[PDB]
């Protein structure tokens, strides 16, 4: 049956979080979490969600039938992963496809591996290592116009961004939040160049700076404005929109700029706060209309870990500015 018109779970058969929405041999492919009721702890660093796999849906039209199309790729088929299938992203470049994804090594560390497939919706084979100089959490690869390939990263608390100033990791009794200094420039995302063979990174990690309308970097306590995951990339009319989770504010929210590295000036907020504590969203055009896939706890009853992805159409007016959307008011 098709789904996409109301706000209303696009599925309802398995839980689905942080969708990753792409245009790929005309259909939109979602890449999400899977949702799994484990039954795991919970605590602020996110060991209650315990996502074991990943299936890539698809969609002709919005509203269209979703099509689930299995398991893409298994966490005991990862060599160096133990535990925490995060949100995932793809790319296509050259007749292959690229899923990227976060997960922990044995050692406990977030960090992001690749894995290959000959189509959009898998299986995909992993890399058995993940990619050198990897860290973190929430890839969004993009592709920019000119061809060029990047991979924006990073998440703070549970995400161990925080842990990753000096080239190093900082330890598992390191900062569980963030630098724990307010009044200093919160941390940035991540963005690198990517290899032309999409496996690698082809220079050293930069940090974004992301800073307010006077030009001043969005400071640590600004917690409603400040980095926190989901970093996500698209373009329009010649501006790059970068767009990102505020986490404990539960905002998406957007930062626009002249080139992939930035900076990021704040603009506003994409989506308000949805059902449960996660915000994780996508921008993508499709048949020349803007689309915002989210999720939220609602298909759970409320359960921050037991989550059901949605979508909505989003408006960018002429001058670069995006309307805000409120999840449950039409
Ligand atoms: O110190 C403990 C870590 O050993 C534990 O890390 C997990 C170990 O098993 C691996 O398969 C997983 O990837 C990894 O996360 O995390 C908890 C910590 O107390
Ligand atoms: O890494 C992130 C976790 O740090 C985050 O943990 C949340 C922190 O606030 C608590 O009130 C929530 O219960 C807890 O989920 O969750 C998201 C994860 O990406
Ligand atoms: O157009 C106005 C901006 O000038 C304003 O910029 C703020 C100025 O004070 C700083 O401390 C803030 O960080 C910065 O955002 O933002 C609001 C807007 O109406
Ligand atoms: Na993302
Ligand atoms: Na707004």
Redesign the pocket.
């Known amino acids: 049956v098709p789904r996409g018109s109301h706000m209303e779970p696009l599925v309802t058969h398995i839980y689905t979080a942080d969708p990753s929405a792409h245009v790929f041999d005309g259909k939109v492919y979602i890449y999400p979490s899977h949702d799994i009721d484990a039954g795991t702890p919970e605590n602020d660093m996110g060991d209650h969600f315990d996502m074991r796999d990943y299936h890539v849906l698809s969609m002709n039209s919005i509203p269209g039938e979703v099509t689930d199309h299995g398991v893409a790729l298994d966490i005991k088929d990862i060599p160096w992963?133990?535990?925490?299938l995060w949100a995932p992203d793809a790319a296509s470049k050259d007749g292959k496809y690229y899923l990227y994804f976060p997960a922990?090594?044995?050692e406990?560390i977030f960090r992001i591996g690749v894995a290959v497939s000959d189509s959009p919706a898998g299986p995909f084979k992993p890399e058995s290592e993940p990619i050198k100089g990897s860290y973190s959490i929430d890839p969004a690869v993009f592709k920019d116009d000119d061809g060029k390939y990047y991979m924006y990263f990073g998440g703070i608390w549970g995400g161990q961004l925080q842990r990753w100033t000096t080239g190093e990791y900082a330890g598992?009794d390191a900062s569980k939040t963030d630098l724990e200094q307010d009044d200093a420039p919160a941390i940035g995302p991540r963005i690198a160049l990517m290899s032309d063979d999409m496996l690698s990174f082809a220079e050293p990690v930069k940090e974004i700076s992301i800073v307010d309308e006077q030009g001043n970097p969005i400071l640590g306590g600004d917690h409603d404005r400040r980095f926190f995951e989901a970093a996500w990339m698209h373009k329009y009319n010649g501006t790059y929109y970068l767009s990102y989770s505020t986490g404990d504010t539960h905002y998406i929210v957007y930062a626009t700029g002249d080139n992939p590295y930035g900076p990021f000036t704040y603009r506003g907020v994409i989506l308000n706060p949805v059902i449960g504590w996660t915000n994780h969203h996508s921008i993508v055009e499709f048949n020349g209309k803007w689309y915002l896939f989210y999720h939220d706890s609602s298909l759970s009853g409320g359960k921050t870990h037991l989550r059901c992805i949605k979508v909505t159409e989003l408006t960018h007016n002429a001058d670069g500015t995006i309307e805000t959307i409120s999840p449950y008011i039409e």
């Open positions: 992963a133990g535990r925490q922990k090594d044995k406990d598992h």
